[PDB]
Design a protein around this motif. Structure first.
Motif, PDB file in Angstrom:
ATOM      1  N   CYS A   1      62.776   0.797 -43.305  1.00  0.00           N
ATOM      2  CA  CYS A   1      63.667   0.609 -44.370  1.00  0.00           C
ATOM      3  C   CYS A   1      64.527   1.608 -44.197  1.00  0.00           C
ATOM      4  CB  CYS A   1      62.907   0.596 -45.784  1.00  0.00           C
ATOM      5  SG  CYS A   1      61.575  -0.478 -46.111  1.00  0.00           S
ATOM      6  N   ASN A   2      65.742   1.554 -44.930  1.00  0.00           N
ATOM      7  CA  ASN A   2      66.653   2.749 -45.243  1.00  0.00           C
ATOM      8  C   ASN A   2      66.274   3.551 -46.278  1.00  0.00           C
ATOM      9  OD1 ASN A   2      68.492   1.531 -43.391  1.00  0.00           O
ATOM     10  ND2 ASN A   2      69.222   0.124 -45.056  1.00  0.00           N
ATOM     11  N   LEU A   3      66.765   4.711 -46.478  1.00  0.00           N
ATOM     12  CA  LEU A   3      66.466   5.706 -47.590  1.00  0.00           C
ATOM     13  C   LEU A   3      67.052   5.269 -48.888  1.00  0.00           C
ATOM     14  CD1 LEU A   3      65.168   8.618 -47.273  1.00  0.00           C
ATOM     15  CD2 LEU A   3      66.169   7.618 -45.124  1.00  0.00           C
ATOM     16  N   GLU A   4      67.894   4.367 -48.853  1.00  0.00           N
ATOM     17  CA  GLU A   4      68.260   3.695 -50.236  1.00  0.00           C
ATOM     18  C   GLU A   4      67.327   2.304 -50.367  1.00  0.00           C
ATOM     19  OE1 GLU A   4      70.653   3.762 -47.550  1.00  0.00           O
ATOM     20  OE2 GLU A   4      72.088   5.091 -48.275  1.00  0.00           O
ATOM     21  N   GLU A   5      66.750   1.814 -49.590  1.00  0.00           N
ATOM     22  CA  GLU A   5      65.990   0.664 -49.608  1.00  0.00           C
ATOM     23  C   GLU A   5      64.353   0.976 -49.545  1.00  0.00           C
ATOM     24  OE1 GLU A   5      66.195  -2.644 -47.265  1.00  0.00           O
ATOM     25  OE2 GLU A   5      68.022  -3.779 -48.136  1.00  0.00           O
ATOM     26  N   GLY A   6      64.023   2.164 -50.532  1.00  0.00           N
ATOM     27  CA  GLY A   6      62.638   2.493 -50.439  1.00  0.00           C
ATOM     28  C   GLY A   6      62.571   4.036 -50.045  1.00  0.00           C
ATOM     29  N   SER A   7      61.390   4.477 -50.084  1.00  0.00           N
ATOM     30  CA  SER A   7      61.237   6.050 -49.984  1.00  0.00           C
ATOM     31  C   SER A   7      59.710   6.138 -49.034  1.00  0.00           C
ATOM     32  CB  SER A   7      60.969   6.642 -51.252  1.00  0.00           C
ATOM     33  OG  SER A   7      59.895   6.369 -52.001  1.00  0.00           O
ATOM     34  N   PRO A   8      60.048   7.048 -48.196  1.00  0.00           N
ATOM     35  CA  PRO A   8      58.777   7.183 -47.478  1.00  0.00           C
ATOM     36  C   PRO A   8      57.489   7.465 -48.199  1.00  0.00           C
ATOM     37  CG  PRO A   8      60.143   9.216 -47.261  1.00  0.00           C
ATOM     38  CD  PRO A   8      60.917   8.130 -48.072  1.00  0.00           C
ATOM     39  N   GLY A   9      56.355   7.171 -47.924  1.00  0.00           N
ATOM     40  CA  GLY A   9      54.850   7.268 -48.483  1.00  0.00           C
ATOM     41  C   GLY A   9      54.014   8.138 -47.934  1.00  0.00           C
ATOM     42  N   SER A  10      52.850   7.592 -47.319  1.00  0.00           N
ATOM     43  CA  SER A  10      51.853   8.455 -46.887  1.00  0.00           C
ATOM     44  C   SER A  10      51.513   7.884 -45.419  1.00  0.00           C
ATOM     45  CB  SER A  10      50.330   8.094 -47.454  1.00  0.00           C
ATOM     46  OG  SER A  10      49.479   9.036 -46.772  1.00  0.00           O
ATOM     47  N   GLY A  11      51.679   9.072 -44.552  1.00  0.00           N
ATOM     48  CA  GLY A  11      51.408   8.553 -42.955  1.00  0.00           C
ATOM     49  C   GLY A  11      52.726   8.239 -42.503  1.00  0.00           C
ATOM     50  N   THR A  12      54.104   8.629 -42.990  1.00  0.00           N
ATOM     51  CA  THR A  12      55.381   8.067 -42.590  1.00  0.00           C
ATOM     52  C   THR A  12      56.270   9.137 -42.252  1.00  0.00           C
ATOM     53  OG1 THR A  12      55.652   7.405 -44.756  1.00  0.00           O
ATOM     54  CG2 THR A  12      55.244   5.700 -43.362  1.00  0.00           C
ATOM     55  N   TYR A  13      57.271   9.029 -41.758  1.00  0.00           N
ATOM     56  CA  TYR A  13      58.293   9.890 -41.495  1.00  0.00           C
ATOM     57  C   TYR A  13      59.656   9.207 -41.246  1.00  0.00           C
ATOM     58  CZ  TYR A  13      59.215   8.974 -36.405  1.00  0.00           C
ATOM     59  OH  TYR A  13      59.494   8.375 -35.193  1.00  0.00           O
ATOM     60  N   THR A  14      60.718  10.158 -41.754  1.00  0.00           N
ATOM     61  CA  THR A  14      62.073   9.601 -41.424  1.00  0.00           C
ATOM     62  C   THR A  14      62.983  10.347 -40.964  1.00  0.00           C
ATOM     63  OG1 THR A  14      63.647   8.425 -42.887  1.00  0.00           O
ATOM     64  CG2 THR A  14      62.621  10.760 -43.402  1.00  0.00           C
ATOM     65  N   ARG A  15      63.776   9.518 -40.167  1.00  0.00           N
ATOM     66  CA  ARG A  15      65.039  10.250 -39.309  1.00  0.00           C
ATOM     67  C   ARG A  15      66.023   9.627 -39.270  1.00  0.00           C
ATOM     68  NH1 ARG A  15      62.923  13.293 -33.861  1.00  0.00           N
ATOM     69  NH2 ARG A  15      61.580  14.069 -35.617  1.00  0.00           N
ATOM     70  N   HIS A  16      67.339  10.064 -39.256  1.00  0.00           N
ATOM     71  CA  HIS A  16      68.606   9.394 -39.092  1.00  0.00           C
ATOM     72  C   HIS A  16      68.823   8.071 -40.091  1.00  0.00           C
ATOM     73  CE1 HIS A  16      69.228  12.136 -35.931  1.00  0.00           C
ATOM     74  NE2 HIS A  16      69.323  11.472 -35.007  1.00  0.00           N
ATOM     75  N   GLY A  17      68.343   8.583 -41.382  1.00  0.00           N
ATOM     76  CA  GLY A  17      68.679   7.484 -42.491  1.00  0.00           C
ATOM     77  C   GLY A  17      67.730   6.381 -42.390  1.00  0.00           C
ATOM     78  N   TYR A  18      66.766   6.245 -41.438  1.00  0.00           N
ATOM     79  CA  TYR A  18      65.876   5.146 -41.430  1.00  0.00           C
ATOM     80  C   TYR A  18      64.622   5.592 -41.476  1.00  0.00           C
ATOM     81  CZ  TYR A  18      69.546   2.133 -39.011  1.00  0.00           C
ATOM     82  OH  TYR A  18      70.640   1.506 -39.030  1.00  0.00           O
ATOM     83  N   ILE A  19      63.381   4.753 -41.913  1.00  0.00           N
ATOM     84  CA  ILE A  19      62.019   4.858 -42.133  1.00  0.00           C
ATOM     85  C   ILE A  19      61.308   4.549 -40.861  1.00  0.00           C
ATOM     86  CG2 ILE A  19      60.021   4.170 -43.370  1.00  0.00           C
ATOM     87  CD1 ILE A  19      61.813   4.439 -46.015  1.00  0.00           C
ATOM     88  N   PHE A  20      60.461   5.403 -40.576  1.00  0.00           N
ATOM     89  CA  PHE A  20      59.858   5.113 -39.233  1.00  0.00           C
ATOM     90  C   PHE A  20      58.281   5.249 -39.249  1.00  0.00           C
ATOM     91  CE2 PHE A  20      63.881   6.537 -36.801  1.00  0.00           C
ATOM     92  CZ  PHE A  20      64.277   5.472 -36.482  1.00  0.00           C
ATOM     93  N   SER A  21      57.597   4.256 -38.797  1.00  0.00           N
ATOM     94  CA  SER A  21      55.984   4.189 -38.717  1.00  0.00           C
ATOM     95  C   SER A  21      55.555   5.372 -38.032  1.00  0.00           C
ATOM     96  CB  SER A  21      55.559   3.060 -38.504  1.00  0.00           C
ATOM     97  OG  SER A  21      54.315   2.947 -38.469  1.00  0.00           O
ATOM     98  N   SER A  22      54.183   5.860 -38.515  1.00  0.00           N
ATOM     99  CA  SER A  22      53.528   6.933 -37.712  1.00  0.00           C
ATOM    100  C   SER A  22      52.246   6.448 -37.739  1.00  0.00           C
ATOM    101  CB  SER A  22      53.696   8.169 -38.430  1.00  0.00           C
ATOM    102  OG  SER A  22      52.923   9.185 -37.891  1.00  0.00           O
ATOM    103  N   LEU A  23      51.900   5.280 -37.721  1.00  0.00           N
ATOM    104  CA  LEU A  23      50.190   4.766 -37.845  1.00  0.00           C
ATOM    105  C   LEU A  23      50.503   3.334 -37.280  1.00  0.00           C
ATOM    106  CD1 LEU A  23      47.897   6.251 -40.493  1.00  0.00           C
ATOM    107  CD2 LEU A  23      48.390   6.621 -38.040  1.00  0.00           C
TER     108      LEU A  23
END
Length: 184
Positions: free
Chosen positions: A11-33
């Motif tokens: 997702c984008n930083l505007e289309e939601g927010s990071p939660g638990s076990g995730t990280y973000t970079r360059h305006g995108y939400i990236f999975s970590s699990l």
RNA sequence: UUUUUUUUUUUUUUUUUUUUUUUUUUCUCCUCUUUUUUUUUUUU
């Protein structure tokens, strides 16, 4: 439903927010699990997206967490334990802990004799407060009405029962002993 | 006929270790003389 790999565009930083076990970079939400895609809509829109495996084999303790333990040995000023359950779930291995003679009761008071509080072999419910030093590693506490020994054990291998806030009694021989009973 | 006040013996302890006798030199070196070699035999 769809699963995850520990990196992908979500997702984008505007289309939601990071939660638990995730990280973000360059305006995108990236999975970590590699768990499951969960979007907690909650209330107020913009769901807090997160990924959870939901099959916890092991989990590291935190600054504040409820743990089920098992006393190994007792001393006049501390009591080494073994972390056995992280809250509810079983633990694959066993960590170590230490209850100093300030965390027994919820007042951090004087007296509080350790000998009759945490007799070895019992199972207690306690909460961590710190990540500890190299001598004592987790520094658990029982300074609450809900924390303390929950399921004790008799002198000769009989399930024990709570009798009071400080006293417990054997059902077979009617013997009186001292513990730190936690509310059920 | 000489009152009142000037503290005291460092705090700490609940650290892991999966090797093995010794160990490393010294060079080539003219052997003198009656001989072929006697020998069965019997008493242990």
């Amino acid at each position: 439903v769809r699963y995850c790999i520990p990196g992908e565009r979500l997702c984008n930083l505007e289309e939601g927010s990071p939660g638990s076990g995730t990280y973000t970079r360059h305006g995108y939400i990236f999975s970590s699990l590699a768990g499951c895609l969960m979007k907690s809509s909650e209330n107020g829109a913009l769901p807090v997206v997160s990924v959870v495996r939901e099959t916890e084999s092991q989990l590291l303790p935190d600054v504040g967490a409820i743990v089920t333990c098992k006393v190994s040995s007792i001393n006049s000023r501390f009591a080494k334990v073994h972390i056995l359950y992280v809250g509810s779930m079983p633990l694959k291995n066993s960590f170590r802990g230490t209850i100093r003679k300030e965390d027994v009761r919820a007042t951090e008071k004087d007296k509080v004799e350790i000998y009759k509080s945490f007799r070895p072999g019992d199972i207690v419910l306690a909460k961590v407060i710190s990540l500890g030093d190299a001598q004592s590693n987790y520094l658990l506490t029982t300074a609450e009405n809900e924390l303390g020994v929950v399921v004790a054990h008799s002198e000769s291998g009989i399930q024990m029962v709570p009798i009071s806030w400080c006293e417990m009694q054997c059902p077979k021989t009617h013997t009186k002993e001292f513990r730190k009973v936690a509310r059920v």
